[PDB]
Amino acid sequence: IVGGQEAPRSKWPWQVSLRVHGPYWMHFCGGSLIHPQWVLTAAHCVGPDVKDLAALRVQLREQHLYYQDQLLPVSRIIVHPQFYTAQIGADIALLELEEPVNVSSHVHTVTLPPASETFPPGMPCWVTGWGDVDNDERLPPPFPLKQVKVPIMENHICDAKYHLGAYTGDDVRIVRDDMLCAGNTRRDSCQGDSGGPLVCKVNGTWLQAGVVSWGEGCAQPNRPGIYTRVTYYLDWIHHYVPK
């Protein structure tokens, strides 16, 4: 997270950390709890090549990484069939937990938006995670969960932004209809925030607008962060997640 504070303890109960085996169960990607047994995350964290489930664990909302690890196992991974790279699109994936989670005041699911929501510019949206804090800098070793409030851009304005200073012809669409844009030179997600939720407070309710996907570096001029547009994939999600 570029910019922003440490998060208040109560504030983001659906945030998940994904761990990979090694000398220790290292954090590598974020996610969100959308149902007591399902986690929503970015496909490029787990694909396109298949992974052994021996190597993966899920951690719920701790405040500081690694201090209180109670690693949950994963029963299955599902990746959108259209995925191959993040710039092509369909960067979305599902994890099914072996054991369901006791929902609690401290651990609660995020709400998915109705398919009619567009999230026009000006909305109040936040992104959260344990990713890097400046363009090359690891989060320092207390490892707090950070948060930042980002601006939203309309897609066609975002596509124009990406064409500045590039050789790509202006006929060629860079930012696609299954994507969403947010952030600016002061406020962005970064490495290791991938797969984390972007949420917006619509009508008093927190809805997940998107998933941290890709960008041309962190906080760079005329390069907003690109997010997977969750409403675009609702029919694919509800084929598996028991609504």
Epitope: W25, D69, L71, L72
Partner: antibody, heavy 121, light 109 residues
């Protein structure tokens, strides 16, 4: 990297049997352990186990009498079986599931050596 | 709950053998494996997730199965392949999982 069981070898009827498994290297933070029993000449039967999330699962008959527990301060897993009878004489094993599932038998990759327990007067 | 067959067999060195395991239902998610128990020591995992060969196992061993019926097959027997074999599988999460009764393989010589 290996497990070791421990136990009394001999117990009389109506005591409570205790067993203990210890992680010889690293810490099995993230991993799971199941307990397997083998009466002489018979095949294997599953007692129970504990998941990476610390959830315990017990076989049909084991719920009446078994408790499984973990203590990171000793890097150990422990089994207790109440009210033993002569028919409990078997080899006992602890084994690890690398996925961390508390109730699975298809991928027990790493095993202890096992210890006999004989129930006799 | 499962049955495994044959309960016993005898076969020469250089022969080929196959063993079956069956069930009333299907395995929740390719969760079936095969174990080799040498006499006097702990069982060893050989095959997991229906057909993945465990590392370091000589690729003499093979297996596959249709969710309800499963097979284990040798390339050809050696003397040290002597063991009892068990299938094991799981039919849900948290519940119905079991070993089979086991098959004991003995060598003509």
């Amino acid at each position: 990297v290996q497990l070791v069981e421990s136990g009394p070898g001999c117990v009389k009827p109506s005591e409570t049997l205790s067993l203990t498994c210890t992680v010889s290297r690293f810490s099995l933070i993230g991993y799971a352990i199941t307990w397997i029993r083998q009466p002489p000449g018979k095949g294997l039967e599953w007692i129970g186990g504990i998941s990476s999330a610390a959830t315990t699962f017990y076989s049909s008959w084991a719920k009446s009498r078994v408790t499984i527990s973990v203590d990171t301060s000793k890097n150990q897993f422990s089994l207790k079986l109440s009210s033993v009878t002569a028919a409990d004489t078997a080899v006992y094993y602890c084994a690890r599931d690398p996925r961390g599932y508390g109730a699975a038998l298809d991928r027990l990759d790493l095993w202890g050596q096992g210890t006999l327990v004989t129930v006799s007067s | 709950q499962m049955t495994q067959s044959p309960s016993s067999l005898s076969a020469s060195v250089g022969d080929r053998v196959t063993i079956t395991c069956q069930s009333i239902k299907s395995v929740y998610n390719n969760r079936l494996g095969w174990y080799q128990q040498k006499p006097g020591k702990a069982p060893k995992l050989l095959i997991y997730e229906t057909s993945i060969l465990t590392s370091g196992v000589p690729s003499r061993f093979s297996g596959s199965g249709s969710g309800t019926d499963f097979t284990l097959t040798i390339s050809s027997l050696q003397c040290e392949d002597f063991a009892t074999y068990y299938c094991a599988g799981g039919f849900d999460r948290s519940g119905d999982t079991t070993f089979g009764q086991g098959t004991k393989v003995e060598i003509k010589r």
